[PDB]
Design an enzyme around this catalytic site. Structure first.
Site, PDB file in Angstrom:
ATOM      1  N   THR A  27      30.731  39.273 -63.968  1.00  0.00           N
ATOM      2  CA  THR A  27      30.664  38.063 -64.748  1.00  0.00           C
ATOM      3  C   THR A  27      30.200  36.902 -63.883  1.00  0.00           C
ATOM      4  OG1 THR A  27      32.304  38.705 -66.400  1.00  0.00           O
ATOM      5  CG2 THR A  27      32.210  36.367 -65.898  1.00  0.00           C
ATOM      6  N   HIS A 174      33.868  48.319 -71.863  1.00  0.00           N
ATOM      7  CA  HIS A 174      34.820  47.690 -70.963  1.00  0.00           C
ATOM      8  C   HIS A 174      36.229  47.993 -71.445  1.00  0.00           C
ATOM      9  CE1 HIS A 174      36.689  45.499 -67.993  1.00  0.00           C
ATOM     10  NE2 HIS A 174      36.015  44.365 -68.032  1.00  0.00           N
ATOM     11  N   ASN A 177      40.618  46.305 -66.794  1.00  0.00           N
ATOM     12  CA  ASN A 177      40.924  44.985 -66.277  1.00  0.00           C
ATOM     13  C   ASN A 177      41.669  44.095 -67.251  1.00  0.00           C
ATOM     14  OD1 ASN A 177      39.643  45.967 -64.029  1.00  0.00           O
ATOM     15  ND2 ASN A 177      37.753  44.803 -64.398  1.00  0.00           N
ATOM     16  N   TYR A 179      41.515  43.760 -70.523  1.00  0.00           N
ATOM     17  CA  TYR A 179      40.833  43.240 -71.697  1.00  0.00           C
ATOM     18  C   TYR A 179      41.206  44.067 -72.946  1.00  0.00           C
ATOM     19  CZ  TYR A 179      38.888  40.037 -68.377  1.00  0.00           C
ATOM     20  OH  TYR A 179      38.700  39.104 -67.381  1.00  0.00           O
ATOM     21  N   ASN A 234      45.796  40.531 -65.401  1.00  0.00           N
ATOM     22  CA  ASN A 234      46.424  40.079 -66.645  1.00  0.00           C
ATOM     23  C   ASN A 234      47.213  41.181 -67.353  1.00  0.00           C
ATOM     24  OD1 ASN A 234      45.592  37.278 -66.547  1.00  0.00           O
ATOM     25  ND2 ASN A 234      43.564  38.056 -67.100  1.00  0.00           N
TER      26      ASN A 234
HETATM   27  C1  FMN Z   1      32.917  37.420 -59.657  1.00  0.00           C
HETATM   28  C2  FMN Z   1      33.384  38.729 -60.226  1.00  0.00           C
HETATM   29  C3  FMN Z   1      33.185  39.002 -61.569  1.00  0.00           C
HETATM   30  C4  FMN Z   1      33.538  40.246 -62.080  1.00  0.00           C
HETATM   31  N1  FMN Z   1      33.202  40.523 -63.382  1.00  0.00           N
HETATM   32  C5  FMN Z   1      33.504  41.753 -63.905  1.00  0.00           C
HETATM   33  C6  FMN Z   1      33.053  42.082 -65.183  1.00  0.00           C
HETATM   34  O1  FMN Z   1      32.249  41.396 -65.836  1.00  0.00           O
HETATM   35  N2  FMN Z   1      33.412  43.305 -65.652  1.00  0.00           N
HETATM   36  C7  FMN Z   1      34.218  44.171 -64.941  1.00  0.00           C
HETATM   37  O2  FMN Z   1      34.549  45.233 -65.468  1.00  0.00           O
HETATM   38  N3  FMN Z   1      34.597  43.881 -63.652  1.00  0.00           N
HETATM   39  C8  FMN Z   1      34.233  42.679 -63.153  1.00  0.00           C
HETATM   40  N4  FMN Z   1      34.535  42.404 -61.849  1.00  0.00           N
HETATM   41  C9  FMN Z   1      35.120  43.458 -60.993  1.00  0.00           C
HETATM   42  C10 FMN Z   1      33.987  44.189 -60.248  1.00  0.00           C
HETATM   43  O3  FMN Z   1      33.228  44.998 -61.140  1.00  0.00           O
HETATM   44  C11 FMN Z   1      34.540  45.110 -59.167  1.00  0.00           C
HETATM   45  O4  FMN Z   1      35.405  46.072 -59.757  1.00  0.00           O
HETATM   46  C12 FMN Z   1      35.277  44.381 -58.045  1.00  0.00           C
HETATM   47  O5  FMN Z   1      34.498  43.268 -57.661  1.00  0.00           O
HETATM   48  C13 FMN Z   1      35.547  45.310 -56.865  1.00  0.00           C
HETATM   49  O6  FMN Z   1      34.366  45.821 -56.253  1.00  0.00           O
HETATM   50  P1  FMN Z   1      33.831  45.178 -54.894  1.00  0.00           P
HETATM   51  O7  FMN Z   1      34.960  45.248 -53.895  1.00  0.00           O
HETATM   52  O8  FMN Z   1      32.648  46.029 -54.530  1.00  0.00           O
HETATM   53  O9  FMN Z   1      33.437  43.762 -55.193  1.00  0.00           O
HETATM   54  C14 FMN Z   1      34.218  41.179 -61.296  1.00  0.00           C
HETATM   55  C15 FMN Z   1      34.434  40.896 -59.950  1.00  0.00           C
HETATM   56  C16 FMN Z   1      34.053  39.662 -59.427  1.00  0.00           C
HETATM   57  C17 FMN Z   1      34.351  39.358 -57.998  1.00  0.00           C
HETATM   58  O1  HBA Z   2      35.893  37.202 -63.096  1.00  0.00           O
HETATM   59  C1  HBA Z   2      35.622  37.537 -64.224  1.00  0.00           C
HETATM   60  C2  HBA Z   2      35.897  38.958 -64.619  1.00  0.00           C
HETATM   61  C3  HBA Z   2      35.478  39.348 -65.852  1.00  0.00           C
HETATM   62  C4  HBA Z   2      35.680  40.635 -66.272  1.00  0.00           C
HETATM   63  C5  HBA Z   2      36.353  41.523 -65.477  1.00  0.00           C
HETATM   64  O2  HBA Z   2      36.552  42.777 -65.882  1.00  0.00           O
HETATM   65  C6  HBA Z   2      36.795  41.146 -64.236  1.00  0.00           C
HETATM   66  C7  HBA Z   2      36.557  39.856 -63.804  1.00  0.00           C
END
Ligand code: FMN
Ligand code: HBA
Ligand code: 8K6
Ligand code: HBA
Ligand code: HBA
Ligand code: HBA
Ligand code: HBA
Length: 347
Positions: A27, A174, A177, A179, A234
């Site tokens: 995101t 999705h 996390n 949601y 959450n």
């Molecule tokens: C800024 C940010 C936004 C994220 N947005 C999403 C998202 O849109 N959907 C999701 O399932 N996980 C989201 N995540 C989780 C990432 O997909 C990922 O699981 C997490 O960053 C761990 O991987 P990494 O250590 O390689 O960053 C987000 C993580 C970050 C840091």
């Molecule tokens: O930080 C925003 C975010 C959105 C969706 C996710 O699954 C995880 C993080």
């Protein structure tokens, strides 16, 4: 050596990935006021097309899904056209991309959708307020009725239909996390006493209805699912959640999905309730393609895959810090460490 990260990976008869590296869904809150992907987003995704597969940022299925500012949708024609520019650019660069279909459930905020009802399995409010916004305190959700649920399944399915016109290669649902889908799968959020609550079968029902409805639109080879068996985002923990996932995973295996993907930030963390890490729990209960994620380096991901822990590695934060992540890993070049301040820029 991380040579195995550059193995071709046949997901299924429809899709073969050029390497094992996924761009994790991230995101960014950079879509326009109509939640249409911008041309800056087009360029952002296009430059990451060396990934075997990009998972887009979470993309809302309808207005009451919105919980953060400027998160793109895929329910209007303008949004579809905007995403088509994104997917066309990724494809023109030799990449592939799935859209991540989102409903935030109790994490939505009515500021974003005209003061409407926030929806969730149960009237169980989360603590606090929307991050990076001024004073948008979370509200008590309305527990969805069965009619709400039918409409939500319909709207997930319609969003999946729309991905064809938008030119994606597929959908990641999705289910992670904290949601909406994950809310049905955990006892903290799901206190229902009808056919969507109580038992593993009932708590899994919404997830499986959404999966099945989407498969009916775009096919199993184009459908993946992200899950969070470990509560962390959450979501308060509950020792009874494990048996929900013990039931769900074999059911998911029957659908022969493109992949299951873990939703976690640091997969080195152990969950007592799962008997260990989230990925190891899933790998012990699910025998098809698994995407690992969460604080892996190219080196530790490569080793995990060599040890049969999972099959594909999603990379999140390092792909923000390093648009050229894949090339740098391929060439053993220095990678920049991510910092949260990098979110201010879409590069
Ligand atoms: C800024 C940010 C936004 C994220 N947005 C999403 C998202 O849109 N959907 C999701 O399932 N996980 C989201 N995540 C989780 C990432 O997909 C990922 O699981 C997490 O960053 C761990 O991987 P990494 O250590 O390689 O960053 C987000 C993580 C970050 C840091
Ligand atoms: O930080 C925003 C975010 C959105 C969706 C996710 O699954 C995880 C993080
Ligand atoms: C958007 C940039 C950073 C996002 C904030 C962090 C989101 C993930 C962490 C949330 C809560 C984690 C605490 C885990 C508790 C259970 C662990 C066993
Ligand atoms: O409320 C859901 C919705 C779906 C498609 C639209 O175009 C607009 C709204
Ligand atoms: O509200 C701002 C904020 C920024 C980063 C966080 O991790 C949490 C909240
Ligand atoms: O799911 C996306 C999709 C794209 C092209 C197709 O032909 C079918 C499905
Ligand atoms: O784009 C913003 C940015 C901030 C801090 C950094 O270190 C790098 C980039």
């Amino acid at each position: 050596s991380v040579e195995n990260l550059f193995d071709t990976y046949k997901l299924n008869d429809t899709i073969t990935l050029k390497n094992r590296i996924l761009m994790a869904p991230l995101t960014r809150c950079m879509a326009d006021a109509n939640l249409v992907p911008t041309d800056d987003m087009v360029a952002y995704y296009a430059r990451r097309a060396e990934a075997g597969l990009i998972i887009s940022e979470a993309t809302i299925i309808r207005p009451d899904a919105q919980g953060y500012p400027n998160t793109p949708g895929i329910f209007t024609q303008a949004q579809i056209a905007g995403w088509r520019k994104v997917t066309d650019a990724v494809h023109a660069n030799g990449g592939k991309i799935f859209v991540q279909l989102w409903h935030t459930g109790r994490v939505a905020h009515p500021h974003f959708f005209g003061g409407g009802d926030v929806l969730a399995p149960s009237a169980q409010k989360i603590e606090g307020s929307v991050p990076r916004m001024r004073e948008l305190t979370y509200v008590t959700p309305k527990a969805v009725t069965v009619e709400d649920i039918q409409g939500l399944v319909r709207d997930y399915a319609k969003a999946a239909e729309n991905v064809i016109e938008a030119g994606f290669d597929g959908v990641e649902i999705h289910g992670a996390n904290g949601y909406l889908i994950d809310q049905f799968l955990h006892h903290d959020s799901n206190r229902r006493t009808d056919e969507y609550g109580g038992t593993p079968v009932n708590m899994s029902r919404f997830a499986l209805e959404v999966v099945d409805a989407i498969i009916a639109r775009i096919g199993h080879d184009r459908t993946g699912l992200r899950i969070s068996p470990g509560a962390y985002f959450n979501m308060a923990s509950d020792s009874r959640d494990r048996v929900v996932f013990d039931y769900l995973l074999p059911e998911l295996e029957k659908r022969d999905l493109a992949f299951v993907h873990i939703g976690i930030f640091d997969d080195s963390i152990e969950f007592d309730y799962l008997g260990g890490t989230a990925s190891s729990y899933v790998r012990a209960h699910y025998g098809k393609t698994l995407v690992g994620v969460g604080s892996y380096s190219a080196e530790t991901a490569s080793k995990a895959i060599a040890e049969d822990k999972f099959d594909l590695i999603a990379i999140g934060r390092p792909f923000i810090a390093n648009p050229d992540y894949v090339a740098k890993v391929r060439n053993s070049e220095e990678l920049v460490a991510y910092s949260d301040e990098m979110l201010a820029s879409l590069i």
